Structures are given as structure tokens and as C-alpha cells.
Amino acid sequence: NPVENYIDSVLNEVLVVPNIQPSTSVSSHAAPALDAAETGHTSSVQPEDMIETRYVITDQTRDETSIESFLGRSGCIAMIEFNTSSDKTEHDKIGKGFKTWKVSLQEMAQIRRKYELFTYTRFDSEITIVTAAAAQGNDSGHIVLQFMYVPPGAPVPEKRDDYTWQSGTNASVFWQEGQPYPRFTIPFMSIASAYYMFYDGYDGDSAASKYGSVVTNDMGTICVRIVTSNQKHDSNIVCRIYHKAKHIKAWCPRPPRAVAYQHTHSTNYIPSNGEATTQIKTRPD
Amino acid sequence: NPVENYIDSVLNEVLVVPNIQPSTSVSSHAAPALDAAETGHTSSVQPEDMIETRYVITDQTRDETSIESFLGRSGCIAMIEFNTSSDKTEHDKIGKGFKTWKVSLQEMAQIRRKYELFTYTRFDSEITIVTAAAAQGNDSGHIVLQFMYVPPGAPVPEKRDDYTWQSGTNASVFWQEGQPYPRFTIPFMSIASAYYMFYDGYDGDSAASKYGSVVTNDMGTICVRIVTSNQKHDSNIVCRIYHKAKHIKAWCPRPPRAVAYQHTHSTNYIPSNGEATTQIKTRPD
Amino acid sequence: NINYFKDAASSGASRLD
Amino acid sequence: NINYFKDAASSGASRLD
Amino acid sequence: SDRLIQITRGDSTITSQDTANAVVAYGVWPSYLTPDDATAIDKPTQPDTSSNRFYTLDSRSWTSASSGWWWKLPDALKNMGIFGENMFYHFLGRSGYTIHVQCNSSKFHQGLLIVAAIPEHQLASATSGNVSVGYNHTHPGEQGREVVPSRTSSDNKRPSDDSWLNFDGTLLGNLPIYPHQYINLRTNNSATLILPYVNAVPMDSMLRHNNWSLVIIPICPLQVQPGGTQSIPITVSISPMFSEFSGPRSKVVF
Amino acid sequence: SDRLIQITRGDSTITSQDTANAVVAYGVWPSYLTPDDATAIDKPTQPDTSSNRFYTLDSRSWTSASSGWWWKLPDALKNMGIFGENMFYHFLGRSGYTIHVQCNSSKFHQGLLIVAAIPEHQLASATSGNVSVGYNHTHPGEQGREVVPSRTSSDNKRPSDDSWLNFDGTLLGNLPIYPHQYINLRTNNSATLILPYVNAVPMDSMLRHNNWSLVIIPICPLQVQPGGTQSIPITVSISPMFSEFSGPRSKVVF
Amino acid sequence: SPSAFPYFHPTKEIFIPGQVRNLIEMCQVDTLIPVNNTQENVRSVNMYTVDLRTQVDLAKEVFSIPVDIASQPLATTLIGELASYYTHWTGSLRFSFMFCGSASSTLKLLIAYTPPGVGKPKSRREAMLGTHLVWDVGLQSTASLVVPWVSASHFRFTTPDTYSSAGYITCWYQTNFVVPDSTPDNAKMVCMVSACKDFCLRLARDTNLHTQEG
Amino acid sequence: SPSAFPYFHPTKEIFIPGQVRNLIEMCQVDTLIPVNNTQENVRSVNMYTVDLRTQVDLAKEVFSIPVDIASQPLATTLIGELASYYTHWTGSLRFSFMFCGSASSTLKLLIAYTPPGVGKPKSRREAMLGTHLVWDVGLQSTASLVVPWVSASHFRFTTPDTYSSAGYITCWYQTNFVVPDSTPDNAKMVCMVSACKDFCLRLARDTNLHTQEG
């Protein structure tokens, strides 16, 4: 029933866990406790098979362990910084008037690790932007930002006032101080049926060919500029980008990362020169 | 009838109080005025039994004395303070760039006392945040706060810019100056079927074991940071957390606290050294 | 009796009984 | 089950199954 | 006669010829854990008759100078035969109680005791700091402990003696809110309380968490004219009801 | 496979991958005392899960010089948790048993044990007079005792070491008349006996009368070539079945 | 009005004895009144007892209290404490008295309620003109006096403002405290208060019976 | 809540093997436990093995671990790692042991679980009083012990706080490790952990098993 489905959803009682059946001592030739893990299959033995038990009605649900639950949570994926200036000449430059970032999920460890539990993922996502601006002077003046999404192959701004910011076909979001945090959705977007978290392959056969998932990354870039002109009071602007997956599918589970990440789109785990060999969380006893 | 229920709810006429029946003098062997309170049961005698009375139609209702009414009201449970600084080095430190608070209801006396009328309680709750910021300089610049909820066992921030603030799985709420007061719900959350207001037991058998309700407290911690970077004009930030219980159940009534509270998660009532013996509200005549 | 959020905890105050 | 936007991607979280 | 009572629990029986009915805490009779409440999957042990019997705690004298007494449950029964042993051989346990308090007197005696069963009676310490009451002081066993108007000790782990504040910062006058019964030497020589299992969880650790605190306080002093008996003993007999245990283990050495 | 077994008793489980079926003494499965047999009027205690579990007795080494071992029931279980405590807190008791004897070896080991359960195994003394075996020597507890080819002692209360005469004046060769099973190191690493309660009375005194004697005798010596393991441990695990107790009392101090 | 923990199923509710639905259920529990508020008694159990003695004179007073539920001494009772969280109150009250003398003791007391606007009675003769009970102490040890809802308004304030005062309860000897030889000439009485079926509280407010400095 | 790419049709979904619906499906996979956590082993494969040898004495210990799923060593197993993203957990666990000696080797082990509040068993005699399995090593190489959900609460914390500890697993020799000539007197055992059908996780949180500095 469609409504019962609604009610269960409201109560978080959709994925219902089995009850424990009562049992008594058994003397047999059957031996649920013995098996061969060599077969590659998890032993099927349950509490009911080994331990005399009382009947227990289970009110536990697995809804919070769903993929939609686990991955469908906002988290920071990037930081973008500006250092504006009253000097019109210095302004308009990258790093001062505008800043760009190549889109990936590999920059922040918490997210990266959660997604790289899977080999392939498919999802739509929400982008939420949190903006801060630290006045360095005695005022903030007027702050208006433009966040432009530039698909792969599209031109990327070189100057704050480039024609590229006209946003003819590129999606753009504007934000003014006092405005609620910007939010928009990016549909699953790829040329494959799923995103590759890992990719065991190359751009080509040559020595210079790229190897990791970087060869599949087709997420484009985000360009952000200060819309307003140079103002008397300089400010430091930091934008944080949060990401939330929706309508999530995932395939082929992987082990979690044991050692610290070193580089974007790489599995390299070896510490920098002079840095002690990477550690894991397994503690000596 | 579902609608009559609605109407009664609208008019606050759900829990209707009985009418007074008329009576005349009675001469009998029955004696409603006499009983044994020794039995532990409240005397049942009513006005109708002892005093000749006229018929009175009662229009009184008990709706305001319901548990949902009594406890389901917002009240302050905490204060969190920051003292920001233009000095980037000093900033980023706890107490300057961020501040943490362990969640409890025991910090504010008014709430604590209302809830510790019961031995066990079960409820969902709303958290509402009220933020103030006192500029110490000639401006406020740009103020953006992040309020992160960190469940027990989760890592707690040491620096304003720690990776922990990425909020991979931790719930976070952002607030900008001019934004309406933040609000969110925390579901009844425990490993028991109710919260323990009191707990007559220990972590363990050893002398160092904790004794009070502190051994049951599983409400985690709230971490708040200034999202923006250091700014020229220092400000003092105070966040107040208000709490409102919803869908409230409660068990086993207790006497109200007679003497001032001394410590969080403790029934100790003895004043500090050199402080006069604790007083009660019972006045000499 | 309109609910705007999926989670039951997000509903308002309980009716009396 | 109200949708406010034309694009399916703009809908909220999926139901469980 | 309404003044008579007989309670039989397994192989033990208690009678009284001068009672004041009985109180069943919260109106709930004790019973076994249902499948709808249970979380453990072990089949529980139900000792029945061998456990659910009356045990008698060391008696104490009530004099004109007494300030009150208290016991903790299940701690008070930890050495009481089978019930006791089951507490040390199992991780979890659950039970209700029948508590019967006895106190004899003549028609020429005066005095009033209040007997109360307090759930989760978290005690206040006797000191000015944030030091909690020590394990050893909340676990007196069969002897409970006496309230003393004042004590001399450096032991900052000891509990408060303020019976007028219920040893926890609440006025004695509000003690009746808890399941209780009085012993008025004019009308009754005994009090009987029936306690259901009360907790936020199905079962719990018998040696870590007390469920009930039995408190007996002389609201009015014992008064006797010369020639009468100047002291009256108070005896407490407690029987587990529907006790259950689960999760067998090596005996706790304590 | 017929060679596999799993036995679950309460919270304990025993498995074996190389068995020789099982023996149920006299073809009778253990059960609770019926109203038609019972003479006591107390309602019996039935600890169920908390009692009816496997307990393991101290293991012993089987060497080329071993002469045999024995244990008495219920004596062997007197300190075994709840079952044990119930024995000391009750006048009467009744139970069946599951006895599982384990002994590992390689395909290069030789030897044969006979495992037997003897009802009313009244022991002969080791002396020439009419002196009976002392209480202390019939109650070795969990460790049972080893048979020694010869001993030097003035203790005329000690039992006979003549395993060839079953310690009572009967030839070993007739030992198979009792419920028994063999452990032949070529074909099985374990033996399992199921014992019903056997007595002339419904229930009896757990600390005065033994019901069964577990006897393990090396019919053929352990033979191992150099380089192999020269000693094999023998471990015995016993579980009460359908245990019942009645007549609660003060714990026997012994 | 979102949840911070989506898909979080609550821990299952189990049956716990003692569920509370309303605060009136608490107000209907007989609770002791600290009548004997003297400097020598406010720090101990004795505050809850009233002394009775064989009298020389007749018709003397035993005790006297206000019946404003959030005034002293009533303010510290369960009802007073709950009442302190409300502004308005109504409905009748029940006052109970337990005799704690000897079984052999004989006593008759007059318990009386005096409506406002006159002032505390100066004599048993005046007290008897109000609502009263003559209590014969016998096999039964407890007597109850119900104080009816007599008022010019539906509600009174919980605030101890003379204007809306509910008046006084006094207790006088009806006969005397009489004992045989070998029985003490002293006795104590224990006073209790509870709500009747018509009792209500209205308009919630912060209690004035508790503070915080730190 | 708009889309930034109106009229954008998604790339067609195709069938890919290995679809995951929930994380419990992962928790139900037998995963190795790094039991042998010594300084000489935590950097290599050897951490996942336990040494067995012919003993001189009887009833000696083989190994001992906590059974708190997010504590060491379990914290680094698949379940521990998934558990570290949740605050609460419940349901029974399964522990499996694989014998890696010779086909000719003979061995019997006692595997036992000890509930909290007593402490680690000091003897096989004590260990046998808990939940246990006697494991006969034969044609079948793997044995499983199920650790039942015994608790005073529906859920325990994943946080390694002694208060809610689930207790210990120990392993003792039942008999001995017995071998013929030409067979090594050594053997190794491999320990695994997996979830039972009733296993659940609740209240998601950031993992404490991974950090970032740059």
C-alpha cells in the first residue's frame, strides 16, 4: 500500500530487521558451527543455531545504513580564496579579482573516503555554497559574487572582466551579502553509466599517459569572481563548497583507505621525502 | 469524532474537569472524612461528601498541566562564548576562533529543575540558536558561524580550520548575520528507552568510577566556529542554545529540588568551603 | 494534518489524550 | 508527492526499497 | 478481617495481624519480561521458587535518638542464597520485590515511621566538592546503614546524613510522592510494598545499578513511659518476584 | 556426515568432527520428575539454561604409563557455577548428564580408552581390613583422581588402584556391561554418553550420594614413534540435563 | 523545522511503570506541610509535626496556617511547588491530619476554615462559624477537611497577594488530650495537603522558589 | 532547489554487477582480524595470524581480544571501519577461525566469550563458564562462534568506553597440538569477524579512524 509505504518512511521503519526465534539444545550430525571459509562464502550460522534463545521481537531497522543515508549528506568538497584589492590594476587578476577550481571529490578526505568505498557510483548532486568575507579595513562595502560553472571544453576566465563572465550558455549563480546560501542541482553527468572512483587504465600507451581516475574526470570547473569593482577597503573572501549526493546508486564495495591520502586522483600513499613511513590505525598491543 | 477532537484542541478543552453535584446533609455510619493515610493512599473524600453544595457546571480544563504543556517550552540550556582576534596566529585557537560545549540539560537551573521532576523522560527536541556579537571595534565586518554537532565517539575540532569541520557525516548548521534564528530537531536519541534524569549506579566497581547520570549521558557535543578568517575589528560572540521538548513522555515523579544546584550531573547540595550551609525556601514564622 | 518533512520527529506538538 | 521543478534531478531524496 | 495478611513466597510465609492494606507501586504488579520488550537473545533463567522467597535483613533498633535507615536493592540481597549467587554468576538480571517492614509495640507506645521505595535514588555526598559517593558506601549489603545526625570522618566518599533532605537535596515532606506506606504505632505493626521492575531498559547489571532504595525515617520520635520497652527493633524482609537472569559467566570476585 | 556432531546446552556448544555416534544409557532420555513418581511436596526449582550447560573438568595427560582416571557425579560439578551453588543450597536434587570425553591424536598414534558410566559405583578400599573408603577420597571434585600402579601411604581410608578389578572386585573385561563407549585413536577423537537419572528414589541428597562414576581406562597403551607428540591430554566436559532442586536451606559449609 | 538526523529510527519504547500524563496527578498525592516553622525546626524533620498536650484551659489553639497554596508553609509542599509554576489556580483543597499519639490516647479536635476578609479567628467560638470538622481520634488515625471553592472569581492567584487570599485554617481543642497512667501526656500531629477532583492550575510561569547565581 | 542544467537527460543506466543497497551487506562479509598486533608484526601480513604450538603444559592461552567492534584490533576490520561511522550498534556478531596447519595435524581449541564486568578470564576454567565453543579441527577447517546480543540496553556505543564494553574473547587449548613425525610442530590460525542477521548500526558520525592535515 502506497500510504503504508509513506507511513513506514515517516517512522524510519522501511528496512525491517528479523526477529529471534526461540530455540532449545540440539544433538545432531548437523554442525552449523563448522564450515569452510575457504569457499569464499561467509558462514551462515545464526545465534539460533548455537545458543539456546528466548523469543525476541526486533524493532530495529536498517534505514540509516542505506546508501542513500550514508552518502546523501552534505559535506565540504572545496575551498576557494580571493584577496581583493583597492588597486584597480592589481584587481581584475586571478587570485585577487577571481579564482577558479577544478571540480572533484578528491580534495577533502572525509568525503573522498566515504565515496571510495565503492568502485562505481551514480548520483545527482546538490551544491551549496557558503561564503565568508573578512574585511581587512573599516568596512565591507558591497559584496556581490558570481559563481560560474564551466563545462569541460568551455573557455575559462583569465580576467575578472572577461567576456566569458557574460554567461551566455554557462550556468551562473549570483550572491549578495545577506542572501541565503546559494543552492543548485547538477544531474548525474558523465559519458559512462557511472562515475569511476578508481580507474585501472591509461589515456594512451606512451610514458607520459595519465593513469588514475583523472582520465575519467569530466566534472568541469567552477569560476568565482567579485562582481563589484575595486573598493577602498580590501577584503579576504573564502567560499566553501558543499556537496550532497541524491538518488544514489553504487557498485562493487572496496576496502576503506587505511593510510593518509597524499595526492588528488591518486592512490599513492607514500609520505614525502624525509617524512616517516605512513602509518595505519592498527595499534601495537 | 476526529474533527470534534480538532475543535476541542483549538479551544483547549480536551482534558475536561468534572462538575460539582448538589448535595444535602447526611447522617450515617459512613464516614468519608475518616481514613488511614497510613495505607499510602490519598484520601478520596470530595467536597460533595462533607459540605452541602449547589450544582456547579465546571468549565475548567487541565490542558495546561499536561506534560506536553509543562515541558514543551523553549528555554536556555547553554551559553557558548568566543573572543575573536585580528591576529591570525591567536585566531584559529579554541576560545578565540572556535568553542565547544558538551550537551546536557544540567547547566541551567530552570530547565534542570523542571525535568528532574521525573525519573525517566522520553522526547524529541528542538534546538534553537540565538546569536549575538558585540563589536569591539568600529565594525562587525562579515559574520558567518558554523554549528557542528558531534556525536559521541566522533572527533572533536582542535583548530578552527581542522579537517573535522568538513562535516562529512556530522550535522552542521550555518548562520549569517541577518539570518533568522537557526532551528533543527534532534530525535529521541539514546540506547535506552528513556533518558535517565537520575542514575543510581556506577561505570564500574573501582573507586574512580563515575556515579551520577553522567554515566548515561550520550548526547555528544556542539562545536561552533567563526567560519570567516581573521578580520581587523575584533568581536565578542555569544551563542545561546534553547531547547524545546516534543512528543514527551515521562515516568516516576520525584520531589522538586529544595536546595541550590552545585554541580553538573550531581545531586551534591553542600555549599563550597566557607559558604554558609545551604538554605531552603521554608521560612521561619 | 500536514507534514512537511519525512521524519516523524519533525512534526509539531502532540495532541492530548 | 509534490514536485516544484520540471527536472527530475531536482526532486528530493529517494525512497528506500 | 481486613487487618490480617498472609504472603507466601516459595517455601517462606509472612503473616501479620495488624496491617494497613498494601501498596503496589504505580499500580503495576510484577511480571516476566515480554518478547516485545526484550533485547537479549539468551534464553533467561527463571529460578522460580528457589529465588523468589523472603529473605530477612539484619534488624535494627529504633530508639528516641534514631535518625533513619536505608537499604539498596538488589544490593541488599547479594548474599541471600540463590538470588544472591545468581547475581554474581550473570551479567544481566531483572526482578520485582515484596518488601515487608515489621515493627512491634504496645498501646502505650508512640511514634511514626515513613517507609518509602525510591527509584534511582542517586545520593548526594556529605562534602562541599564535586566528589561523588564511593561504591562501597552505596553497597552496604544486608545491613544497610544508619543515619547519624553528625559524623567525624575524612572520607569524602561518604553520603549525606540529611534525612530531612532525603539525602539528595529534596525536602522530606515530599517523600510521599514515591511508593510508600507509614507505620503508626497506634494502628499498624507492619508495612508492605510491592515493587515492579522499573528501569529504562529490559534488564540490567545487578552489581552496578541499584533499582530501588528502601528508606525508613522516624517522622515522629519513639516515646515510651518508664517501665515500658524503650527500644523497638525494626525488621525488614524482602522477596524477589519473577526474578530473571541472563548471560552466564565466571563468578564475580568483587 | 555421520562423523559430525554438535551439542548445544544453554549458552555452551560442543562440536566434534570424528565421533562414534552416541550412547544413551539404557535407552532412556533424561526428563523432569513426574507427579506419579514424586514424593516431595515443594515446588521444584528448574534453573534451566543457567544450570544445564557444559562445564569442563581439569584435563589430564595420557602417557604410556597411565593406569586410568575417574570422576564422581554430581561431585565433580559441585563448584561449577550455578549447578554447583544449587547443590549447596538445597536438600534434594535430581539430574541427568551429557558427558563428552575428548582426546586428540594423529594417524600415527595408537591406543584405546574405555569410557564407562557406572551407577552406584561403590568402591573397595586399598586395605585388608573392614575399613571403608573415606568421604574425602570419594569426593575429589573437578580433578577426579589418577590411578597409580602402587602407592605408599598409611591412609587406610584410600580406595583401591586396581583398575583391572574396576576398583571393586569385578573384572575389567566385564566393564562393557555398563553404558560405555570407546576411544580408539584410529577412528574417533571423542565419546559421548547421555545419562538419565538413575536411583531407587525420585530425588536425593547431592552431597551425600553419588549417582554415577565416570571411569576412563587405557585398555591399550599409548604408543608413539619418536618425533611425534608423546602425551595426549584427555578432557572431560559434562552438562547437567533437566536438573531439579528442592528444599532450600542455608548453604552447606562443608 | 528539519531533523538533523534523517532516517534515524528511535530506540524502541518499552513499558515503564509510573507514566505521568498531567501534573494534577501529582497534586492529588497527600504531601506533608512544614507547619512548625521555627528557627529550631526549619533544619530538621520536626518541622512537619505539630505538638498536642493535655491542657489546663479549654478551647486553646493547636496551630494556624494560610491556605494560599503557594504561600508559606504550603509553598514548599508538592502542590505549592507545582502551583508556583502557574499564575492562576482554582478548585477545592483537601487537608488531612494524622494523629501520632498512643493507641490509649483520647482526643477531639476542631479543624476550621475561615474565609478571607475577617482575619485569623481569635477564639474557637469564632472558628466554629466557618467551615469546620470535629475530629474524633479513634481506630482511624486520619481525618480530612475539605476546603470548598468559595470565591468571587473562577480563579485566584498563586501569588501571595492579600487581595486574593483564600483565608486561614486553624485548629482548636474541642475537648482535651486525655491519657491514662503509663501513657505520655504529649502527642504529635502530622499535617498533609492534597488536591480534590476539581483542582486546576492555569497560565504557566517561572517558579519563584528556586534561583541560580553561577 | 533548481537544476543548473535544464533539459539535460542523464546518461542511460546499464546493468553493473555488485550493486550495494545498504552497508550491512558489507558487514556480513567475513573479514580478517589483525590479532597479532606486535611492533614486529603491525607492518606486515603476519599481523593477521595467530601461532599454535605443541604445549608442555595444559590449558594455556592462545589469544585474547576485546569484542567492542570499533576498538582495537576490530576497529580496522570492515565492520569496525563501517561501525566507526555510526554511534550506536546492536545485534549479535560472528567470529570465525581458520586452521592453517597440516592435514595431518590434530587440535582441539576452546573459544570463549566473557560478558563484561568481570574482566579477562585468568584460566580456561573461568573461560568455560561463559559462552563457548569447543572446536574439533578436522576435514573442515573453519569454526564459527556466535556472540549473542546480551545487553542491558538495545544499543551499545561504538565508542571504546569501558562502561558499555561488550567484554572479551579468549582462546585456550582444549587438548593440545599433536603431530606425527615429518609434520611441523607449529601452525597458524586466522581469525575473521562478520555480522549476524540481527546486526544494526545507528546515528551516523564522522569516523575517528582517518585524518587530514593538508
> What are the distances in angstroms from CA A238 to CA A129, A241, A262, B230, B254?
10, 10, 24, 11, 52
Q: How many Å lie between the alpha carbon of A6 and the closest alpha carbon of chain C?
A: 9
Distance CA B164, CA B155 (A): 7
Q: Cα dihedral angle (F25, F27, F29, F31), rounded to 10 degrees? A: -90
G128 and B CB contact within 8 Å: no
Contact call for residues H104 and F107 (beta carbons, < 8 A) = yes
Phi first, then psi: what are they for A119, rounded to 5°? Answer: -85, -40
One-letter amino acid of A16: V
Distance CA A198, CA A267 (A): 9
Nearest CA among B12, B45, B34, B47 for reference residue G91: B47
H154 and G CB contact within 8 Å: yes
Distance of CA A92 to the CA centre of its chain: 31
> What are the distances in angstroms from CA B86 to CA A233, B158, E12, E116?
16, 19, 78, 61
Structural domains in chain F, CATH included, are 1-254 (2.60.120.20)
Using DSSP, state whether A110 is helix, strand or coil: helix
Please give the residue of chain A at the shortest CA–CA distance from G8: A64
Using DSSP, state whether H115 is helix, strand or coil: coil
One-letter amino acid of H74: L
The grid cell for H95 is 567470529
Q: Is the dihedral of CA B119, B120, B121, B127 positive or negative?
A: positive
Contact call for residues F246 and F44 (beta carbons, < 8 A) = yes
> What are the distances in angstroms from CA H8 to CA A170, A185, F149?
14, 12, 94
Q: Is E176 left (phi over 0), alpha (psi -120 to 50) or beta?
A: alpha
Distance CA A157, CA H6 (A): 23
Identify the H or E element spanning E181: strand E180-184
Per the DSSP assignment, residues forming a β-bridge with G20 are B250
Which residue is listed with cell 574512580? B208
Helices vs. strands in chain B: H and E counts, helices first: 4, 10
Please give the residue of chain A at the shortest CA–CA distance from D14: A247
Helix axes E81-89 and F81-89, enclosed angle (nearest 10): 170
H93 and E CB contact within 8 Å: no
> Per residue, what are the HEC states of F40-89?
CCCCCECCHHHCCCCEECCCEEECCCCCCEEEEECHHHCCCHHHHHHHHH
Contact residues, chain E to chain A, C-beta under 8 Å = 35-36, 38-44
Q: Do H207 and B204 touch (CB under 8 A)?
A: no
Distance CA G194, CA G95 (A): 6
B185 and C CB contact within 8 Å: yes
User: Residue H205 gets which letter from DSSP?
Assistant: -
Per the DSSP assignment, residues forming a β-bridge with A20 are A56
Distance CA B192, CA E209 (A): 14
The grid cell for A28 is 545432531
Which residue is listed with cell 518499552? G14
Nearest CA among F234, F66, F238 for reference residue F163: F66
Distance CA G129, CA G114 (A): 8
H157 and B CB contact within 8 Å: yes
Q: Would you mind telling me the total number of residues written for chain E in this entry?
A: 254
Question: Up-side HSE of residue H180: CA atoms within 13 Å toward CB?
Answer: 11
> Cβ contacts (< 8 Å) between H75 and chain A: which residues?
281
Distance CA B131, CA G27 (A): 39
Contact call for residues A242 and A108 (beta carbons, < 8 A) = no
What is the helix, strand, coil percentage profile of chain D, to 5?
20, 0, 80
> What are the distances in angstroms from CA E157 to CA E127, E128, E139, H73?
8, 11, 12, 37
Distance CA A24, CA H92 (A): 18
Which strands form H86-90's sheet, in the order they lie side by side? H156-157, H86-90, H200-204
Q: How many CB pairs under 8 A join A and F?
A: 46
Of C7, C11, C13, the CB nearest to B72: C13
Using DSSP, state whether G79 is helix, strand or coil: helix
Number of other CB atoms surrounding residue G122 within 10 Å? 10
Sort strands F145-146 and F69-73 into parallel, antiparallel or unpaired.
Answer: antiparallel
Distance CA F200, CA F202 (A): 7
Per the DSSP assignment, residues forming a β-bridge with E93 are E204, E245
The grid cell for B180 is 533568522
> What are the distances in angstroms from CA B220 to CA B105, B129, B154, H196?
12, 17, 9, 28
The grid cell for F2 is 555421520
Number of other CB atoms surrounding residue B176 within 10 Å? 19
Is there contact between H and C if contact means ≥3 C-beta pairs under 8 Å? Answer: no
Q: How many CB pairs under 8 A join F and H?
A: 105
Distance CA H197, CA H28 (A): 8
Distance CA F185, CA F234 (A): 12
Q: Is F27 left (phi over 0), alpha (psi -120 to 50) or beta?
A: left
- Which chains share 3+ C-beta pairs under 8 angstroms with E? A, B, F, G, H
Which residue is listed with cell 539528595? E168
Q: Is the dihedral of CA B257, B263, B268, B269 positive or negative?
A: negative
Distance CA F222, CA F183 (A): 12
Q: Do A65 and H22 touch (CB under 8 A)?
A: yes
Nearest CA among A21, E42, A23 for reference residue H149: E42
Please give the residue of chain C at the shortest CA–CA distance from B12: C16
Distance CA F73, CA G21 (A): 58
Using DSSP, state whether E27 is helix, strand or coil: helix
Q: What is the resolution of this structure in A?
A: 2.9
Distance CA B165, CA B156 (A): 9
Sort strands A221-226 and G200-204 into parallel, antiparallel or unpaired.
Answer: unpaired
Q: How many Å lie between the alpha carbon of A8 and the closest alpha carbon of chain B?
A: 16
Distance CA E217, CA E144 (A): 13
- Which chains share 3+ C-beta pairs under 8 angstroms with D? A, H
E202 and H CB contact within 8 Å: yes
> What are the distances in angstroms from CA E175 to CA B117, E169, F13, H117?
13, 12, 51, 34
Distance CA A90, CA A226 (A): 13
For chain D, breaks with the C atom over 2.5 A from the next N come after none
> Which of H:10-49 have CB within 8 Å of F?
none
> Per residue, what are the HEC states of chain F?
CCCCEEEEECCEEEEECCCCCCEEHHHCCCCCCCCCCCCCCCCCECCHHHCCCCEECCCEEECCCCCCEEEEECHHHCCCHHHHHHHHHEEEEEEEEEEEEECCCCCCCEEEEEEEEEECCCCCECCCCCCCCCHHHHCCHHHCEECCCCCCCCCCCCECCCHHHCCCCCCHHHHHHCCEEEEECCCCCEEEEEECCCCCCCCECCCCCCCEEEEEEEEEEEECCCCCCCCEEEEEEEEEEEEEEEEECCCCCC
Interface test with G, best of C10, C11, C15 (most G CBs within 10 A): C10
Pick the CATH number of G1-214 from 3.20.20.450, 3.30.413.10, 3.40.190.10, 2.60.120.20: 2.60.120.20
Q: Do B232 and A177 touch (CB under 8 A)?
A: no
Distance CA E61, CA B74 (A): 50
Cβ-based burial of B125 (10 A; exposed 0-12, middle 13-18, buried ≥19): buried
Nearest CA among B249, B269, B250 for reference residue B109: B269
> Cβ contacts (< 8 Å) between F49 and chain A: which residues?
52
Distance CA G177, CA B153 (A): 68
Contact residues, chain A to chain F, C-beta under 8 Å = 25-34, 50-52
Q: Do C9 and G1 touch (CB under 8 A)?
A: no
> Cβ contacts (< 8 Å) between E164 and chain G: which residues?
43-45, 47
Cβ-based burial of G175 (10 A; exposed 0-12, middle 13-18, buried ≥19): middle
> What are the distances in angstroms from CA H10 to CA A122, A124, D6?
10, 9, 14
The grid cell for G71 is 504561600
Please give the residue of chain B at the shortest CA–CA distance from E207: B205
Distance CA H110, CA A33 (A): 13
Interface test with E, best of H93, H151, H153, H165 (most E CBs within 10 A): H151
Sort strands G156-157 and G31-32 into parallel, antiparallel or unpaired.
Answer: unpaired
Q: How many Å lie between the alpha carbon of F78 and the closest alpha carbon of chain E?
A: 14
Nearest CA among E174, B31, B61 for reference residue G193: E174
Using DSSP, state whether E83 is helix, strand or coil: helix
> Cβ contacts (< 8 Å) between A51 and chain E: which residues?
41-42
Q: Would you mind telling me the total number of residues written for chain A in this entry?
A: 285
- Which chains share 3+ C-beta pairs under 8 angstroms with B? A, C, E, G, H
- H helices of chain A, in order, are 2-10, 47-50, 67-71, 109-115
For domain B1-285, give the CATH number. Answer: 2.60.120.20
Residues 6+ positions from B193 with CB-CB distance below 8 Å? B122, E200, E201, G11, G12, G13, G14, G16, H154
Q: How many Å lie between the alpha carbon of F42 and the closest alpha carbon of chain E?
A: 7
Please give the residue of chain C at the shortest CA–CA distance from A9: C6
